[model samples]
Target chain A: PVHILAKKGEVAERVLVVGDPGRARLLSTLLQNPKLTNENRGFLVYTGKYNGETVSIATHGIGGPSIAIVLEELAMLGANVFIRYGTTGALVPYINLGEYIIVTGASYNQGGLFYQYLRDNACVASTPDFELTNKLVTSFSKRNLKYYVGNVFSSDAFYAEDEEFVKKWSSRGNIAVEMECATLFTLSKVKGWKSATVLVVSDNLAEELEKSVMDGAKAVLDTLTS
Target chain B: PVHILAKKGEVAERVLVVGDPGRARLLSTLLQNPKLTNENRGFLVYTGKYNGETVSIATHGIGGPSIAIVLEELAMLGANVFIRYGTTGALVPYINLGEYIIVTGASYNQGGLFYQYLRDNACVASTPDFELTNKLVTSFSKRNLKYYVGNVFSSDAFYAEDEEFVKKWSSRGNIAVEMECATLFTLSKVKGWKSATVLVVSDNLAKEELEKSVMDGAKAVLDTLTS
Candidate 1:
């Protein structure tokens, strides 16, 4: 509530959370008659309709810590079911740019917000809602969009990635590296909120998607309205 | 090699590692004819004797990353067995100052050197050697010293501990919070080296033992040089 200044009833139950404010704004166009709900703390939130269903798109900034705060505040503002549509770096060699990664689970180093929230170093299962994730798979498939489904290592330090970094996480069953999925999944489970993620490869979206981003956004909106 | 300037064989197979150099120097007085093996990069190492068996007292600085580097170099220099006799804060209210915590296992956040070494976010069992740990328990008990046995949360961030921090870790089965034991236990497992730890309660040692520190140090030394 302190971070997201959106009035109650202005936000939607099914929300598309993004990291970049620009991406949040761009995606808002797809929603019919999108209205700015909250812009405080540089977190842009828009409420609108997609496929005749009321939907909201919001920005969640960077890292586990940042996203945790945003999610908590948004949850306080009447939002529940969330689908994070963000960008990520592929940890494996085969996952090319512009494709989607529907996150199944997240691997993370215990500490920071996770330690503070979970109250210990116990590795609580950082997985998405099974039904929501399955819906994501179905929606992407129907749209003929390329996507992979696997675990991702949610790194605390983004600048720490290197050749050794890629090899280490990829070998440990993660297909990509991102910052917020572990926190998103873990917090959602603890709070009894439904959540899932679909990441468009940054390497692909930069060279691969202008059309791909919109198409993927439509797929997510369709899933949200469904 | 880069951190410790101690040459091969100058370091003993049975070693006692501590975080403070001053403690290392003070503990060395218990050793017979102790020799300064290395002082490079402020990591003071002393090779000497206890109960007629050769041993060494070495400093391992602060935190998991620091200790991991020190342990790796010490292992490289022919040190096979290690007993870390350091200080810790009791996470539980009942534990008095100057008592001992003979570590059973270490719980840690997955990152830093652990990720680089283990090559993943896997929670590899960070437990000390069973035989070495039993020896620690027996050694402490025989001395008639006050002690408890349980797991510790090996914290990476020292300044982060608060009332909430204490409550959090203690509930998850950790009796104390220290900086290096998880890395010590995990690295030992990965490298096939033997390691164990015994921590004296900081709140107790200040008022409880100028004598308690020396006595506890001797107990660890005797355990290390045990047959």
Candidate 2:
């Protein structure tokens, strides 16, 4: 009701969600038996058969607030398995640009859609989503793509004036930075859905990169299901 | 210092702070004897005579984190009086769009910069600067600009998705919403300085305004010469 534009039996049990609508369509195009079922007010849905299993794809858009609506609706629609393909900014020196990161957990330094479910003291971690994360990482590594598994910081602001605050967060051992993982993973636990994040390092704060690295990263994700 | 980019004796004892650097410069241009003393990074400082009293004007950008830096630096520079002129989103029905709002206190929902200074139980309000707020409200009323004095919620996010969360906050009697006052006033008290905020309602959530109102609010600051 909140986010999904589907009825009771419209979607499958497993789903892959990207934040961008255009990316969602591209994902659907990669499916073998893709069928475009629903498109409602910025929310897009496509179902298909992949690897002899039924899977669906959707777009949640940018930021926690908008994503929360999609999540609540998806849960209501019976989509239990979710794999988030996203990009993050590296906060640590060890994380290389264009490398994939399987998020083990996320620090809530930023506001997210999930804060409505519980208080700040409550630790919200993905519910054994490591199995899915491992599968994706292995699939990428076999193709010789660079990747790592670790923690990330989810922040409210993309631009902040407080460098001291950023320094403090960086010192706390956050490996990468993203906007939606904390809320997505937390809400998965609250809604009893299996969820995980597979992020490609798009940028780095520790070392400056001269050129864009997003295209090469997308190529790896494109072949992940194949 | 941390934010205002001023040294000891650089700023006057009495001061006015606007949110925009350009606005601060414009206000300085209105002063009769204005002198540019300090310019560090983007923060500009002007010392001049206002209403026959030596005064200073500076800019503190949007939100608590940025303003906090300006306040700490200004305190170290021996400048005490502070007033903020910025815009806010209206949550209350009675408050019209584009009307002035004199913030009596602020709800510390943003986990203010003062969290670094005290425990979570410490109550942070802009009460100490109440007299100046009253004077400013009276002045605005005299100019026929409808104004209200009440509590405003300070949030970290400019855009929120959860309607339930916003409803809960509104039900608690928050008149309007803004970004920076909690940290500003809390840090002011900890540093032994007086601070207040004068807000103009830019957007309304209840009526769901399609566009923000016209920007026309100004800060009338009177720094305590005694302190």
Candidate 3:
């Protein structure tokens, strides 16, 4: 609440969260009459109607600590369900850029925010809402867009990702790498809020997906609204 | 120093660290006339003489974030060498409970404190000071205690673990899984502090005879610290 700073009802129950402020601004155009809800810590939250459903797109910044603080504050303002529409680096080279990866599960290193909140270093099952994830899969398919479905290694450190890192996570079943899904999904599981993720492949650690950004957003909007 | 409110002289340049306050207190008794240096933030610090070397025993509490803060503050107060004497679960079944695991390297998920501190996500070699780790091995062997030397998975979520967690990490060459070693080892590498860890096996990941093990583990870590 302190970080989000939006009044009750200022935020919608259904939220579309992005890690970048620029993406938040870029996606706001899709919402009807998008009114800026809060912009205090560079987390620009815009609330408006999408396909007749009230929704808000909020910037979560980068990394787990940054997103964890924002998510908590936003939840205090009454957001219940969240979908992280951020970007990712594909671990698989065959997966072209501009496509999407729907997060089924997330693997993370122990400690930091997770240990502070969950209070132990048990690798929690960080997955998304089953129904919400399938909705994403179906929605993307309905749009005839290219997308992949599997687990993602939600990294705390982005630059630690290297050629070896790509091999390590991929061998463990993670198809892509990002910074926030483990936090988002793990927190949602603990808090009992429905959560899922749909990442537009930007820089394939395994880059060229520019045209499908909005299209993927449109597909995510379709899922969130439906 | 923020959490551990010890004044400059009260803290030592070399330390025997732990995760629980009780363990710190009990181990403090092993030293000659241990004095309580700082107890603020439930982070109890005891400074005393071990084998004629000035050392402090501190409680780092649970997780990477907590330990990282404690380590940073301790460093600020002049501590440069740390030996984390904590409990951990054996990721491999063959290791057995009540044994010791002297960590060679730590495997962790990238992000959180590492990203903030290291400024990127490259998995830096999160290993302990080479000579310090070897000293732990020598000390443990001298005591005739059974121990393993290997890497460990320093986890963040203690209860969030799924069934395959043990198989997954152990197969990756991690013999045990604990909370703070990854943070401890990684932070030590970057900060240029000499650090190593020795864990009393609490389970097969999955124990018994912990009391004697603690004493033996403490003495071993102490011997390593002073040497």
Candidate 4:
């Protein structure tokens, strides 16, 4: 009721949620036997058969606070494994555009979910679902895609001019920056659920990447779905 | 320029800033030979004699972020020593209303200034101006006023419904809750300045003490004149 505008049991236990609602529809269309369960308030839920396994996928909008509400509601509806397939900004120099990175931990540089749940001293590291990560990485590697595992920076201000702050953080060895992983990991820990994030390096801090090439990015996204 | 709105050389090196602007006026009026330097933007500045020593006093508004801007600008203008006089919400059970607390450290539950200064893993603890703290403590003790020296909590949110969270913090051993000291002490370390805080316990959480008489609290404010 908090985030998902869905009834009880409308969402399956194992779920995949993206940041965009239209992507959720595209994923359902790609499935073998798909059924649309709920579509309300930009939260589209779809249930179907994927590679002989029944799974549900939903769309959680961007950022921590909004996604936190979605995650809590998903747990209430019996979701056990939550995987986020999203985009990231590469912090390190070696990571190229269109590469993949598996998040191992998160540095909370901005406000949102981690500020409320954990103590000041407690470090927020993801409980790596190694099995899922290994599966995804191996699947990607078989297709000759570049991938790396490292920490990501979670931030609240999408339009803040904190370049100096970000430089300070990257100097301390954070590898990437994203918006929602810290909250996803913290909320999963508090509720005893499993969560992991696999991000495609859409941009690099050392260089600017164009958003106009989103169609090219989608082609890379489609390969990952395979 | 940030919060106090004082120009360079307008404030003395050793300064005492109260929270209320009106209190700064009262202190200025109370001084026998006070000279008003600047009173722009409601930040009243007065250089006067307290106990025959030339000192300056002004008022810094509430919370850490705003106060941080003041301290930074003051440091830029060559003001070094800062002693804060303010109020607090008591977390401990024994700390009665109208008591004083000398903070040795504060739990940085708020936005950390030290962390912002890139001093990571540095917990919020005082730089141990032991001689100064002792002098203030002894002054209060001589007057038979109750005081305690311990750690307090600094939080970002003004209102929270997290009673369980508050209980958890109390159980972990915070003596009080305030807004500004954690960042103040952290910035003091980064800038290599000497600073201390003396708080009047205005509200008590353990016995649910709120809205008590503040006559002695007002007197404690006057006591800082001698220091």
Candidate 5:
């Protein structure tokens, strides 16, 4: 309620949130006659009609703490169902840049903002809602888009990635790495919101963003409205 | 290894670690014939004899990432057992300033250094070694110091502790809040090192500093670590 600054009816029931403010603004164009709802705290939320259903595209900022604040406030303003559309770095050699990753589960380090919100360091299941996640899969496949379904390691340190980062994370079953999904999925569960995440591979650490931008948002929007 | 700038045998097998570099120096005075070992990366490591046993008191700096880096480097330099002697903010109202907290478990959020080291999201058992932890209680009781034993929330965003911070953490079963114990205990568990933590209550979300009390609290942790 404090960060988002969006009014109750300004945010729609179905929301498509992105990590970058620019991405949020850009994707808002995909909706029919979008209206900018909130601009405070640099969280730009836009509401419009998509697939004949009211939807909102919001900016979630860079990391877990930033996104946690945005999501919490957004939910407080009556926004419940959320779909995070963001970017990620591939952990495996096979995932190519610009291809999409539909996250099944997210792995993260337990501590920091997570401990304050969740109350403990227990690795609660940070998985997305099955129905919504499956919806993303169907929409992507119907369009014949290149996407991989797997678990991602939601990392806090972007500059902390080193040379051995690929093998360390890839060996643990993480297909890609991103900043916000773990916080998004886990907090949604605790807050009783239906949540899911999709990432466009911006780069890959296994020896590896933009062309599929609208393409990625299109799939998520189709699923959110469906 | 990277930051410690020490070789094998330079650091002792048992060590007492602190958050402040100056505090590390102050506590090093308690050891007989203390010698400065490493000063690189803001970590001042002093190795000497404590009650006839060789032990090192090291500076770990503030927060989880700093402590994680320091602990890993110290481990690389032949240190296997560590006991953190630092300060805390009490979450409960009854605990006063200048008191002690003998920690059992650590609660933390997920992300950052742990995600990198653990290679995945896991709330691995962030608690101290049972035998080492018991030794801390024994030493403090022997010294007749007042201490509360319980779990502490090891946080990264120290400044982010808001108005509801006290009741928020205390309600979650953490009696105090600190910055390094989660990384201290969890990294110790995964890496096979025996670690424990004790804190000097400097301030509280509800209320409170004592270097003499800090030195005294450190001596007891060293007693447990060297035991």
Candidate 6:
């Protein structure tokens, strides 16, 4: 509530969080009667109706720390269910650019903010709510859009996804590499909230595939409203 | 070679190693003029012409300890390059039974045989030789076979692939679970020999797809003896 600065009644119970402010602004166009609920701290939040349900699209910056705080504040504003739609880089060669990766689970290195929050470096099962995730899978499939169901490596460092980093993580079993999902999924589990993530493959570390943010936006919105 | 007993030059420069003695015997039929080079210690080995070049198909038994000793002995008897064809369980649900997994790299737990051999438990890159692996892909693709290219979790324990175990390893990013590729790839790197792996999804932890050993057998032999 402190960062978001939105009254309890203003924000909706269902929320869709993203990383970039520009993306939040862009996607708000899809909502009906979209009203800017909060712009405090540049976390642009818009509340609008989608499929006869009130949903908020909020910006949650980059990485775990940023997303964690934003999610915490949003929950305080009466939001309980969330779907994080973001971008990712495919670690393996098979997945092409602009496709989608519906995150099944998130793999991460131990310690850091995770240690600070969880009290220890135990690798908690950072998986999304199974039902919500399945709905996402069904939603994307219904659109006849291309997507891959697999685990992702939620990295803390950005530039570290170099050649050696890519090879090592891919060898460990992740199909795509991204940031934030481990913290998002883990925190949602602890807080008793339903949360899941679906990412657009913006670039493949391993081509250009047919890709558009709007194409995936409708699918995520449909799942969120469902 | 204490185990192989295949006199020097009896074995070929290129070799195919498998875990089951029965599978070795079954695949030996693909090679022309195949000779039973040695059958000592139930480690069946056969040498013959595969695509007009000398190749040997040998049984390596199971696990790191067993395959390590067999590979060492095979190298001593003049074999250098190797390809391990074996069975695996798909760790993820998407992959179907009777398909193939051309292993790009292997992920394993630290310690045990790896600790003993390397002297410390450093995660050395357990990847296959680039050229050889690409050749396997080419061979398999040429045959119009269904295959997936990805890394595999090489488990040490047999019955440990329970539900929790499957979720853990699959989350770590492995596509399939198998018994020996980690050791094989690691030892091959250390010993300066070329090694790669191709696995048959006989059972899926994740059903039935169109799969046959003969369909994959010729592709492996063609890759093994490819100049």
| Residue pairs clashing, model 4 | none
Which segments of candidate 3 are over 4 A away from where they belong? A1-226, B206-208
lDDT (Cα, tens digit) per residue for candidate 2, span B41-133: 346678887567888877665455456666667766778888777778888677777777888887754322343455344565545476767
- Candidates in order: C-alpha RMSD to true structure: 14.9, 10.7, 14.0, 14.0, 11.9, 10.0
lDDT by residue for model 3 (B64-159), tens = 655776788898898999999988888887887788999999988765668766766788888999999888899999999999899998876554
Question: lDDT, candidate 4, residue A82?
Answer: 81
Please write out the lDDT profile of model 1 over residues A1-226, one tens digit for every residue: 7557899999899989987667888899998999999876457899998878899999876556557767887888888999999888887777787889999999988764566566688989999999999999999999998999999888754432356776778889988878789989999998899999999887421135777788899999988889
Candidate closer to the true structure by lDDT (higher is better), 1 or 5: 5
Candidate 1 chain B weakest ten by summed lDDT: B203-212
Ranking by TM-score: 5, 3, 6, 1, 2, 4
Span of ten consecutive residues with least summed lDDT in model 6 chain A? A118-127
TM-score per candidate, chains pooled: 0.52, 0.52, 0.55, 0.49, 0.55, 0.53
> Which regions of candidate 6 deviate over 4 angstroms?
A207-211, B1-227
- Per-residue lDDT, model 4, residue A111, is 28
lDDT of 6 by residue, B1-227 (tens): 56778876888888888898887887888888989989999999998886777889899998989999999999998889999988888988888878788886676776788768765534444666655776787788777778887668787789654557766556544679888898898788668788888988877776113335644644654564555
Task: Please identify model 5 stretches exceeding 4 Å from their true place.
Answer: A161-163, A207-209, B1-111, B114-164, B167-227
Clashes of each: 4, 1, 23, 0, 12, 3
lDDT of 6 at B182: 86
Collision count of model 5: 12
Q: What CAPRI-style quality would you assign to candidate 2?
A: incorrect
Q: Which docking class does model 5 fall in?
A: incorrect
lDDT string for model 3 (A1-226, tens) is 5457788989998999986566788889999999998866457899999889999999875566556767777888899899999888898898887888888999877655676567567888889999999999999999998988999987754333254787888999999988778889989998889999999887777623456888999999999999
Who is ahead in DockQ, 3 or 4? 3
